[PDB]
């Protein structure tokens, strides 16, 4: 028993991290097969970031200008191209540590692990969720750009995120591995305000199921609700509307605990309306929303 | 910016995990050089755990009874010995993935990462603290025994914990890598109640400094306090007494923020006395105590 904000083992990703330098800018790159993926803003100076013309800036760069280092060994760059907001640096050597991998574009509410890196070296790993406003609440300092988000299914690493920037509000924006930003964000230093950060209702419910499975049951009540009634309360508290798809996804957790999804929604409704009254759930004093129903099943069953 | 409960990159430890089976019991082992370390309760049946005589149970076991598997390859056991509550299985092959390592016995209040494993396979990584009552609040299911806790300093892995058991209260107990339990716990299925789980005051203060560094400042007040006055409040709230050693350890954080340690203690005192009033600090609605002052500096500076 016990329930923790758990990240995937980072080893498969650690073997892919490299350092990319272009001019005076150093960030991280992801080396998979004979391609190194990195944010295209590696070609910018802090001054260029105000209004950069990436195509024009890239014309002044040749293969020899991208310095790619894996550990202490230099990789030879034999090609470069820009795909959306990422650069693809073709190198002459396939990464021998390349795991089985996929590039996936995740939906808001889905979780992933981040391997924070600096100078191609890993500093730490933590679990994130893509927020409904397409930002992530990470831990990234200057030099962390190019650090990636991923999920692991047995031996396959699904890369879903690459770090690009911090908004003036302290939240983070990045792209999928095709270089398309999540949300409306652009790789420019301009007024980019994030929209409403709503709570991921289905994840909160999944975490309430995890609480019951791990012994915390004080919040269970004698009530039930309907999807429409619950959603009226969810609207009031800036929670995402719960759908029948969400109810269906919570089916296995409902089956394991014997608590019907709508009964758990009524517990959640009372928790939103009355608060925790100084109590905690799974060591938290707020309703946690960065565990998907898949994460709860995975952690509660011990999938490796 | 941004502050997360971050674990160390787990790759160096992933390469050390193996599966150990003895009879019908399968748990994890740690393969370092030509020795595999695992909990001695691998030789027990669930029935033996009530009152096990480990020396007598071990007499009935030979080298060929300990099945050690690294991935899908079988390791040959050429010796076995019991050191305290761990078994040391000498194998004929040195682990080629052995990192630079140390075995350290940590003090209560210190943090470490845990690589949860099942059948020698990693499932996830999370950050823990050794509680003042010598338990850890982990996420461990049956089969996770032998999963280890560690810290990393550049290329050296300092192993500090090996998982052995869950107390009837849902908290976890384990040993250092010499097989000595943290706290008064024994590898027996008996009434083992944990003592008072006090809050790690110096860690809470370090996390308050992290909050100020990352933009959350609402809790800063116009007050100061003394070590003795603060400790009277800390006693009342089951917080560990703050010492001058703790103040000294917070020196670099005090210097970086310009907030004197005792002024931060006065903010903490007001937070204990008045609560959060429905507000949050670094996305938490309670005072976080599983970040040491070293963790805060490390994460805020980006050490790899
Ligand atoms: C990313 O790593 C990044 C973003 C902004 C500024 C900066 N300087 C160096 C690297 C960066
Ligand atoms: C540890 O992994 C462990 C503890 C208690 C019970 C159990 N059965 C198999 C393995 C275990």
Q: Locate the domains of chain A by residue range.
A: 1-14+100-197, 15-99, 198-301
Distances (CA, A) of B181 to B70, B143, B161, B177, B178: 26, 19, 9, 9, 9
Answer whether B1-14+100-197 and B198-301 agree in fold: no
Fold of A1-14+100-197: Thrombin, subunit H (2.40.10)
Instruction: Give the active site residue among B117, B128, B145, B265.
Output: B145
CA-CA-CA-CA dihedral for B16, B20, B26, B29, to nearest 10? -30
> Closest chain A residue to B274 measured between Cα atoms?
A278
Helix/strand/coil (H/E/C) assignment for every residue in A210-262: HHHHCCCCCCCCCCCCCHHHHHHHHHHCCECCCCHHHHHHCHHHHHHHCCCHH
Gap between the Cα atoms of A189 and A184, Å rounded: 14
**Nearest CA residue ID for atom 6, ligand 2:** B142
**Beta strand pairing status for B156-166 and B100-103?**
parallel
Going from the C-alpha of B285 to that of each of A284, B241, B276, the distances in angstroms are: 7, 23, 7
Specify whether the CB–CB gap between A112 and B124 falls below 8 A: no
Ligand 2: residues with CB < 6 A are: B 25, 27, 142-145
Token pair in block for residue A213: 């499975």
Q: Which helix (H) or strand (E) holds B36?
A: strand B35-39
Residue B239 backbone class (left: φ over 0; alpha: ψ -120 to 50; beta: rest)? beta
Other C-beta atoms lying within 10 Å of the C-beta of residue B141:
16
Local structure of B78: helix, strand or coil: strand
Name the token pair of A146: 């190019």
- Method of determination is X-ray
Q: Token pair 């027996």 is at which residue?
A: B188
How many Å apart are CA A23 and CA A58, to the nearest integer? 12
- Could you tell me if B30 and B160 are in contact, meaning their C-beta atoms sit under 8 angstroms apart? no
Residue A43: closest CA among A26, A31, A29: A26
Residue B249: CB atoms within 10 Å: 17
Q: How many contiguous H segments (helices) and E segments (strands) does chain B have?
A: 8, 13
Backbone phi, then psi, for A148, in 5-degree steps?
-120, 155
Q: Kindly list the distances between the CA atom of residue B256 and the CA atoms of B53, B209, B210, B213, in Å, as whole numbers in the listed order.
A: 55, 9, 10, 8
Burial track B227-246 (b if 16+ CB lie within 10 A, e otherwise): beebbebbeeeebbebeeeb
Query: Element (H or E) spanning B59, and its range?
Result: helix B54-59
Query: For this experimental structure, what is the resolution in angstroms?
Result: 1.6
Q: What is the DSSP string of A115-184?
A: EEEETTEEEEEEEEE--TTS-B-----TT-TT-EEEEEETTEEEEEEEEEEE-TTS-EEEE-TTSPBSTT
Do residues A91 and A35 lie in contact, with contact meaning Cβ atoms separated by under 8 Å?
yes
Q: Which two tokens stand for residue A229?
A: 């009634």
Superfamily name and number for A198-301: main proteinase (3clpro) structure, domain 3 (1.10.1840.10)
Select B15-99's CATH number: 2.60.40.420, 2.40.10.10, 1.10.20.10, 3.40.50.720.
2.40.10.10
Consecutive H or E run containing B252 = helix B251-257
What HEC string does B258-271 produce? CCCHHHHHHHHHHH
Q: Hey, is the C-beta of A286 within 8 angstroms of any chain B C-beta?
A: yes
Burial class from Cβ neighbours inside 10 Å (0-12, 13-18, 19+) for residue A99 reads middle
Tell me the CA–centroid distance for residue B38 and ligand 2, in Å: 12
Return the closest-CA partner of residue A259 out of A301, A219, A201, A287.
A219
Contact B304 A8 (CB under 8 A): no
Decide: B163 and B144 in contact? Cβ < 8 Å.
yes
Contact A93, A168 (CB under 8 A): no
Contact B115 A9 (CB under 8 A): yes
Question: Per DSSP, what are the bridge partners of residue A22?
Answer: A25, A66
Q: CA-to-CA distance for A212 and A208, rounded, in angstroms? A: 6
How remote is the C-alpha of B63 from its chain's centroid? 31
Is B181 at the interface with chain A, CB within 8 A?
A: no
Q: Would you state the structure tokens that stand for residue A303, as one six-digit string? A: 């999938």
On whether the CB atoms of residues B155 and B146 are closer than 8 A, the answer is: no
Question: Residue A222: which residues within 8 A CB-CB, separation 6 or more?
Answer: none
Q: Which of A175, A131, A123 is nearest to A17 (CA)?
A: A123
C-alpha B219 – ligand 2 centre gap (Å) = 44
Q: DSSP string spanning A18-75?
A: EEEEETTEEEEEEEETTEEEEEGGGG--TTGGGS--HHHHHHT--GGGEEEEETTEEE
Contact call for residues A150 and A157 (beta carbons, < 8 A): yes
Q: How far is B5 from chain A (nearest CA, A)?
A: 7
C-beta atoms surrounding B286 within 10 Å: 19
Closest CA to A147 of A125, A172, A115, A177: A115
Q: What are phi and psi of B158, to 5 degrees?
A: -100, 105
Chain A residues within an 8 Å CB radius of B118: 302, 304
- Are A302 and B141 within 8 A, CB to CB? yes
Q: Read off the tokens for B293.
A: 């002052």
Q: How far apart are CA B292 and CA B204, in angstroms?
A: 8
Q: Flag if B304 and A170 touch (Cβ within 8 Å).
A: no
Q: What is d(CA A299, CA B108) in angstroms, rounded to the nearest whole number?
A: 26
| CA separation for the pair B117, B277 (Å, rounded) | 40
User: Catalytic site residue A164?
Assistant: no
């Amino acid at each position: 028993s016990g329930f923790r904000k758990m990240a995937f083992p980072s080893g498969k990703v650690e073997g892919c991290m490299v350092q990319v330098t272009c001019g005076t800018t150093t960030l991280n790159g992801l080396w998979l097969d004979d391609v190194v993926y990195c944010p295209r803003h590696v070609i910018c100076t802090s001054e260029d970031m105000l209004n950069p013309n990436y195509e024009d800036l890239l014309i002044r760069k040749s293969n020899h200008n991208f310095l790619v280092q894996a550990g202490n060994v230099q990789l030879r760059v034999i090609g470069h191209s820009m795909q959306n907001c990422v650069l693809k640096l073709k190198v002459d050597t396939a990464n021998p540590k390349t795991p089985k991998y996929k590039f996936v574009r995740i939906q808001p509410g889905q979780t992933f692990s981040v391997l924070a890196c600096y100078n191609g070296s890993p500093s730490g790993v933590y679990q994130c969720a893509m927020r409904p406003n397409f930002t992530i609440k990470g831990s990234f300092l200057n030099g962390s750009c190019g650090s990636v988000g991923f999920n692991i299914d047995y031996d396959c690493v699904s890369f879903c995120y690459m770090h690009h920037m911090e908004l003036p509000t302290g939240v983070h924006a990045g792209t999928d591995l095709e270089g398309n930003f999540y949300g409306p964000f652009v790789d420019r230093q301009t007024a980019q305000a994030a929209g409403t950060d709503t709570t991921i209702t289905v994840n909160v419910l999944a975490w309430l199921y995890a609480a019951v499975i791990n012994g915390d049951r004080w919040f269970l009540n004698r009530f039930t609700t309907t999807l429409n009634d619950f959603n009226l309360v969810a609207m009031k508290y800036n929670y995402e509307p719960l759908t029948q798809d969400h109810v269906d996804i919570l089916g296995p957790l409902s089956a394991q605990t014997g608590i019907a999804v709508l009964d758990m929604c009524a517990s959640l409704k009372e928790l939103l309306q009355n608060g925790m009254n100084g109590r905690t759930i799974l060591g938290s004093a707020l309703l946690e929303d960065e565990f998907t129903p898949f994460d709860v099943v995975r952690q509660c069953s011990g999938v490796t």
